[PDB]
Design a protein around this ligand. Sequence first.
Ligand code: SF4
Ligand code: SF4
Lengths: 32, 32, 232, 232, 90, 89, 246, 50, 50
Amino acid sequence: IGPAALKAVYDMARKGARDEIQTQMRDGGLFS
Amino acid sequence: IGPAALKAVYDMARKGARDEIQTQMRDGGLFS
Amino acid sequence: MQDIRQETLNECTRAEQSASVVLWEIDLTEVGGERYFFCNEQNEKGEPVTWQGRQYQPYPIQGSGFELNGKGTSTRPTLTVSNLYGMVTGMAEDMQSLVGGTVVRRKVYARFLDAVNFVNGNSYADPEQEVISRWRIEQCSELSAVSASFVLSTPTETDGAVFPGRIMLANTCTWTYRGDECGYSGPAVADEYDQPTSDITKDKCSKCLSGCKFRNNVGNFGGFLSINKLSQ
Amino acid sequence: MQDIRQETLNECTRAEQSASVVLWEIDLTEVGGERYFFCNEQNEKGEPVTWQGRQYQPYPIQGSGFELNGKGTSTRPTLTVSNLYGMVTGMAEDMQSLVGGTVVRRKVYARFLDAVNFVNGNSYADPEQEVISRWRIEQCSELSAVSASFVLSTPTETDGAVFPGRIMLANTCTWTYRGDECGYSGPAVADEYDQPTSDITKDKCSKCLSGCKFRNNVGNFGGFLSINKLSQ
Amino acid sequence: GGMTGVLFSLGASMVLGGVAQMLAPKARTPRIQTTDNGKQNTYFSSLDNMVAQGNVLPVLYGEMRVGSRVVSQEISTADEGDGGQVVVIG
Amino acid sequence: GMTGILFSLGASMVLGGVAQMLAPKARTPRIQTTDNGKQNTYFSSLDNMVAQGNVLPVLYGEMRVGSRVVSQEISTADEGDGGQVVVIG
Amino acid sequence: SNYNPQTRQYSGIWDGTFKPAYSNNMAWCLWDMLTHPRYGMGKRLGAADVDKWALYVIGQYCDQSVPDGFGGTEPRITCNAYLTTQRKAWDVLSDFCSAMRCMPVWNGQTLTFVQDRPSDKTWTYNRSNVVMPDDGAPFRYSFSALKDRHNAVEVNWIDPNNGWETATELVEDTQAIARYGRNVTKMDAFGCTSRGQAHRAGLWLIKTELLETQTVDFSVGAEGLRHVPGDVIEICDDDYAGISTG
Amino acid sequence: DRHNAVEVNWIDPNNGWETATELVEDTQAIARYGRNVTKMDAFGCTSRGQ
Amino acid sequence: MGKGSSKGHTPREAKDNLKSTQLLSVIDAISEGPIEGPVDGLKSVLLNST
Ligand code: SF4
Ligand code: SF4
């Protein structure tokens, strides 16, 4: 089904982006 | 089909990340 | 703790609950509009839902994300209303995108509606059991010819604002004309461009020194006459 | 506005469109190469497409992501080219990975190609109606044994550049050799390490005071002789 | 490949920063110091002598008296002499 | 079972520079307008600081440098370093 | 060559000729900044890569003899800058464009600048020239935000009259304060040596922020795609929002 | 991304133990690519040679 | 006077018995490229804001 998959993928992408922001701002990385 | 799904997910994970970047820097987030 | 009465709290723990109705009130009186009452669903008589005597007309509405939090940014729930026949755009073009208005969300259980909503009549009616929330509209991110999306925010949201709101000196003033700080209450003497206007329909102050002199209230001038603190 | 002729704009109004054709020109003269002409498709005769007299040979080329904007970042569209038989790798190993060259994209409608591309012969040919864009290759993000992806950029894009190019130095020159400031045109006298040579192929200044003294152009030295400004 | 799904329109996603920002690119305010007190210096004024060590040479575009970058400062004994022969020290 | 989506990232790392792939590169300090146009060194402090906020520093060779003053005190001196040679006039 | 840098009077058609002369203009200040060898990153881009005709139009627009507060007659925007610190090229370019109220784009394979100067409509669109993707409604409107609509702006400018020192001048609207809240914002006017120019810049910002509050996204067929280069003016004739038949 | 002009900050014990900037570049890299200037202090440096 | 190079001086006033006076001499770099001269004559030189 379209809309359910779209909303699920959007929320999962938001969670992934939040996790990436959290993990890259520790000591090194590119210091976002 | 594979590549269509992959391109769709990649382009869907763009505006999600952009909105996350924009909201986390507004008032009381981690400023990206 | 909430102000929920004992009876609804008792009923909410029951195994076989009833329908959960949500009603919405859009208040624009503080902006210059009227009070609009909406409900997502109607009764069995094909009539607007009657609650506390008043009638909520059945119109498109749906909210998502209403939540209370303390960490990070403030919560911004999203409201959606179907814009058919141009009804939403009609008030949008007249009320400046419905910004600054108030939205009140009332949550009620089905077994407490007015008796006129049921063919047999509900004997368990008590029009004082509901949960109330209040928010303010922030922006209208979508006004397509099919729907309309609104962003909500807390009334006490703070951002883009600084605490100590004064700017030391200026050749110009900083108060508001005819307030409790300027203190002037006389007849019209000057206009925005500092011309001898005796008409009150277009009285304005240039907030400058000459405009203040025109009204003999130079004592209450907010700007300090330093200027040369940086040059000298 | 665009430099669009009236005829092609008039044709681009009707419902029954013709076939859109995209042709690419890779220019490497400014970097030390040749001009390569590519087309994604060939004519009905199984021959290279003839346009304006010149010929574009068939090769799998695909440009995606052309986004002209005034805010945010710049534009970086992607060009994909099939790397079979090692043809792309051949020039990449020679032309420093195709860095610094120019790419020109021309789009044309089918009904304006040369008559030799059609068995009956087009009577509507007009080799002056096309839309032209130019970009510069920035990097070869990925070149495998089956394909090759190039990133494009605008020629005037600023990135990593500073405005006040002037830099204050103590004992090192700032400009080139013989270009505009070193008004030297005599025989070669020095080399990289300030050795007394008289051969022109090894004449390169050491960017020092001694080089200037050797070349008798100390009056045109870019290094100010301050040095001892921070010790005192 | 014939179709291009997920159009993904961008409307308020760029308005959210402000509307004048998408017509004019705004300007960059300098950083505020503490020992400087309240003198809010900008990026196009300098009324004091600077030091020209590994720095850039400033440019000027119109009017607006400015300072400089000192390259050589030296004090010597002022010898007696004018543009002529009149050298009376009595 | 299978382990898909390797997603090679060799291209992404070079985007920030290639010399950084072998050297972390030295950090650079910021420029204070108040300190004229002088450039602050990250490994030398000629000026003698105040013993409080600044952490107990470390030396590694040469570098005539300042310090962190712990106690400064000015009083009246004695007339005579020592011995019996104590003349005044 | 056509330009006279004394009275700022144009006379006749302009050719691609140049004359070395003093000036106090603004657009040509950007031209000197952009395409200059030695120090002005001229080695990265040639003279033919920038739209000099747009610069000429801007410079003609920058001298309109607007009225000042004292009753005099002065040019709208004038460049008086002293760049003494090294900074990114994009930062200086953005500062210049903000002072000119212009935006740069790579349009028609040549860098050009577009400002908010009133002009005549180029093209017109109705519902039959656009496509509804899946939802049935092709036009997609949106508006600004309440906390985003600025009403009070403090601009910093250099005051040659007193001591060539910085000075802050604030601008606000009473009716905007009554309708929305108070939204204070700081700004640095680039190369300002007159109170009138700073006041005009602040007034333009608040006005263009209070009036233009509606942004629409839609789609366009291939035939009109290349027809519209970008940064142009047009009309979106919609019969669904106008409750009529366009 | 390919830098060819570099400025290094080193302390100079000879004059006054002050900071000094030294520039390094290649002419052929100037001719082939553009000029890309980058600054980095030479941590621990005490001689122009290093 | 403007053009490309200019010089100016003011009459020295001293004498009154044999002495020896100092003489501070300093060079300043203003800007780059062909600049124009001061708006007025030698008065434009401001020492201690006068
Ligand atoms: S200026 Fe004088 S008169 Fe005008 S508002 Fe401020 S105080 Fe009232
Ligand atoms: S050092 Fe003297 S000679 Fe060598 S380049 Fe610079 S100026 Fe020309």
